Amino acid sequence: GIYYTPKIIVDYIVKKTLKNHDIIKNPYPRILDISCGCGNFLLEVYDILYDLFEENIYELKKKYDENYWTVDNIHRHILNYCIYGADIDEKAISILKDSLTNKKDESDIKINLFCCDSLKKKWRYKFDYIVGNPPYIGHKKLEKKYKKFLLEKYSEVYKDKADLYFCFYKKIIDILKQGGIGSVITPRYFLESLSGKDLREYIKSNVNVQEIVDFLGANIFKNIGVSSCILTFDKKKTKETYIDVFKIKNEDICINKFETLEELLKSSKFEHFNINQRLLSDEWILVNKDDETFYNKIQEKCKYSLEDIAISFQGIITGCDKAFILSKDDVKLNLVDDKFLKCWIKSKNINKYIVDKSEYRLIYSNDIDNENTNKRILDEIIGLYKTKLENRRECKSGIRKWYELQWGREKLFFERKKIMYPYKSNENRFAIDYDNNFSSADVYSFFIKEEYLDKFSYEYLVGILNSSVYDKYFKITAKKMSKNIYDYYPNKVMKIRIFRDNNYEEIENLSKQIISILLNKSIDKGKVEKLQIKMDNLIMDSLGI
DNA sequence: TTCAAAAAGTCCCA
DNA sequence: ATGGGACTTTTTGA
Numbered sequence A: 001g002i003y004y005t006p007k008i009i010v011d012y013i014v015k016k017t018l019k020n021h022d023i024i025k026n027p028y029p030r031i032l033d034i035s036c037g038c039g040n041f042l043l044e045v046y047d048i049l050y051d052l053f054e055e056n057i058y059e060l061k062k063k064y065d066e067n068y069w070t071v072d073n074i075h076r077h078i079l080n081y082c083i084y085g086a087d088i089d090e091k092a093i094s095i096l097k098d099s100l101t102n103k104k105d106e107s108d109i110k111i112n113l114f115c116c117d118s119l120k121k122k123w124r125y126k127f128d129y130i131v132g133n134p135p136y137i138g139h140k141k142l143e144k145k146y147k148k149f150l151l152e153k154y155s156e157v158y159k160d161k162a163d164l165y166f167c168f169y170k171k172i173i174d175i176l177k178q179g180g181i182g183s184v185i186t187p188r189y190f191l192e193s194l195s196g197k198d199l200r201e202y203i204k205s206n207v208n209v210q211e212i213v214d215f216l217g218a219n220i221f222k223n224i225g226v227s228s229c230i231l232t233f234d235k236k237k238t239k240e241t242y243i244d245v246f247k248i249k250n251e252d253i254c255i256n257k258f259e260t261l262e263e264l265l266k267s268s269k270f271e272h273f274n275i276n277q278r279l280l281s282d283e284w285i286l287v288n289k290d291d292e293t294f295y296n297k298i299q300e301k302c303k304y305s306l307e308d309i310a311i312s313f314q315g316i317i318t319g320c321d322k323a324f325i326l327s328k329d330d331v332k333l334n335l336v337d338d339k340f341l342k343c344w345i346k347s348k349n350i351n352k353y354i355v356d357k358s359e360y361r362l363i364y365s366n367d368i369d370n371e372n373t374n375k376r377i378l379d380e381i382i383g384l385y386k387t388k389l390e391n392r393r394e395c396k397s398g399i400r401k402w403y404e405l406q407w408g409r410e411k412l413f414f415e416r417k418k419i420m421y422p423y424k425s426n427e428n429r430f431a432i433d434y435d436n437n438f439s440s441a442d443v444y445s446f447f448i449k450e451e452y453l454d455k456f457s458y459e460y461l462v463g464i465l466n467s468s469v470y471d472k473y474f475k476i477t478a479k480k481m482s483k484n485i486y487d488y489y490p491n492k493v494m495k496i497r498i499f500r501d502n503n504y505e506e507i508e509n510l511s512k513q514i515i516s517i518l519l520n521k522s523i524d525k526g527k528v529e530k531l532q533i534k535m536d537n538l539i540m541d542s543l544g545i
Numbered sequence B: 001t002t003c004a005a006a007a008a009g010t011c012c013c014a
Numbered sequence C: 001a002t003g004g005g006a007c008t009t010t011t012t013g014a
């Protein structure tokens, strides 16, 4: 439950908040970490503070009580008035307390360390500087009893599938003094995610965001599947409202390339651009001027969105795939009448323009009337996981029988011509499904509304949607998950805007040529790339880019 | 009644 | 052993 932040990032975060502190004007700064752990940040705060006091000790001695301000008194002063920490783990607090003590009995100095829940603590005062790495706990791994507390007391930032670190953002902001500075490393997903919409609104309207360091899919925490960003914000009265954005360019770099993180930020490994905080909508579109011009051209030119013209839906959720999904060559499928069997595909089966032939079959068990008529299917296939099936939420409440699919959706939505795409991918992969394929929630589908069929065809749509233009266009606002992975979920895919002009016929014809080649047995892959290049030129011409 | 979001992902191998 | 790559379930709030 304890995570170690890399030292190069700890040093950067502490420097970001304290490098320009006027210790002569205010020799009593309050620096807080509300998930301090063993003290990765606080122990570094001590070192920075000690040099700060020692470098100006005679100036403080002259300006203030000359007996109080001596070098031998710096250690006691820092612990009494400057360093504050909180963590739920008692053992970590005890270790940090020893570490701070060992920086030097005489007078039994008191240390401001609290073993508590930082989201419930009654904070008796606000703080000049707040740093640290909060806990990240999503909606599956958080206790329901605790989530009831969060939904009640942190509703301004925490609803639905929000994360625990949203609340730490709110708590840090609320107890930051006027003119104070906060700097934290959290997951990056709130920058684009639907869940973070309220959190983004809370940050934008309560603090000035100085800087966002976006590591994208780079691996900052070794052996941890998370993508990181560093946010620095303040409560200073400033007319200027511009954010420094540092966005990494190569996700494969090692974080220890230089001795300092700021060396990496200034280098060619990162790009820098500024964003006007006043121009942030509910979405934070953090791109350079070239991409903003590119994005705005497409938005203005396109009069339709996919949501306008299409019906979206998520795939089947069985609740226990091993009980219902079988290999098409499994001998146990001889027990299942073919009326119960559906073709089943995974996200990896989706390519551009077409789906691979399915290798798995879904038992649509919802169509099994009762347990007596098809006892063989229940006893020998589905019942092998009856205990796990009975633990599903809708089975415990009696809504579903133990052998039914948890979310079987509507069969008629899948058994039709439609477009399918993987839920997480490195690139746009929109395919026309001709084979009534079913899938789990790792594949999303949509079909065109009847009233828009004479304006848009499936062949045209997969043409533009798979183009290099729309690959770049979608990724401008897409949710970056891990290295070379973006979420392709309807909450953003359905916002993709599309156009219709004089190039419609040739774009559609090129797409049909690609599909015809891809479906050939002696498939000529090379010519497909040439046709794609020609289609990209038409699309770039159509959108004036 | 029933939708869709959510990576401190998960798992394997060189 | 670790770091990097291939691939992606079902729990959950609304």
Ligand SMILES: OC[C@H]1O[C@@H](n2cnc3c(NCc4ccc(O)cc4)ncnc32)[C@H](O)[C@@H]1O
Binding pocket: A001, A002, A003, A034, A035, A036, A037, A038, A086, A087, A088, A089, A092, A116, A117, A118, A119, A133, A134, A135, A136, A146
């Ligand atoms: O690296 C993360 C670090 O933060 C610490 N930490 C995790 N959760 C909390 C916390 N409130 C949230 C909460 C949630 C559920 C609870 O049953 C109880 C409390 N309040 C303070 N510190 C917390 C950890 O111990 C790690 O040292």
Ligand SMILES: [K+]
Binding pocket: A061, A062, A063, A064, A065, A066
């Ligand atoms: K004096």
Ligand SMILES: [K+]
Binding pocket: A216, A217, A218, A219, A220, A225, A226, A227, A228, A482, A483
């Ligand atoms: K990562």
